[PDB]
Ligand binder design. Structure first.
Ligand SMILES: CC(C)(C)NC(=O)[C@@H]1Cc2ccccc2CN1
Length: 207
């Protein structure tokens, strides 16, 4: 069937849709289609290109209130600028200086503000199940289900550790810490990366 209304969605509303590039872009919801138990959402992007999308591949073009965001919520967030999908790993608290921690679908982790977040319209029941990379998907499942039990390594600036990159271990140094993230300096390459303190890319977490 062709619908005009479906839950809180209405044909003609402005929305965000996931493109094949895996970045998300503004468009208009031009149709809602049911095929038995299934639903699909036709989006006309602002370049005139059209996609027929599942409801987990559209997001509202507003920032949700704090009380609708949980650990495990499926969101689109500003990725450092593209909009990219992720999972809420932390909500605002004193220890994170009132920010949201996002685990993006590619494994990148970043703190963001409410104004950098958008809610996915029809998330899956197990919100991680549409994470394409299986290693990332399993990590998020474990993290979200185990929460608030979160093993993390306690690290201090100047500390020498081994960090993973491209499947091998590298000599590295902790440059700074920000909440649940650590900025690692790869010593040979002389460049830095922000990494989650519970990541098994930090050899102390792996071992
Ligand atoms: C862009 C980020 C994520 C900082 N990565 C890099 O710049 C990588 C980091 C790295 C680590 C060990 C050995 C070689 C390399 C090459 N550049």
């Amino acid at each position: 069937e062709n619908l005009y209304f479906q839950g809180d969605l209405i044909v003609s509303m402005r929305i965000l849709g996931k493109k094949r590039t895996k970045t998300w872009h503004k468009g208009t919801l031009i149709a809602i289609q049911t095929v038995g138990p299934g639903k699909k959402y036709k989006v006309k992007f602002d370049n005139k290109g059209k996609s027929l999308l599942s409801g987990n591949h559209i997001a509202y073009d507003y920032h949700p209130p704090a009380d609708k965001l949980y650990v495990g919520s499926r969101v689109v967030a500003k990725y450092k600028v593209w909009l990219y999908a992720g999972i809420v790993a932390e909500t605002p608290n004193v220890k994170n200086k009132l920010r949201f921690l996002i685990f993006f679908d590619d494994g990148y982790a970043s703190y963001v503000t409410q104004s950098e977040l958008y809610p996915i319209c029809r998330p899956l029941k197990k919100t991680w199940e549409d994470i394409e990379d299986i290693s990332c998907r399993d990590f998020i499942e474990e993290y979200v289900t185990a929460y608030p039990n979160r093993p993390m390594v306690l690290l201090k600036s100047g500390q020498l550790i081994k960090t993973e990159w491209e499947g091998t271990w590298w000599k590295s140094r902790v440059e700074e810490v920000d909440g649940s993230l650590v900025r690692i300096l790869f010593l040979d390459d002389k460049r830095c990366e922000w990494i989650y303190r519970g990541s098994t890319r930090l050899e102390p977490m792996f071992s």
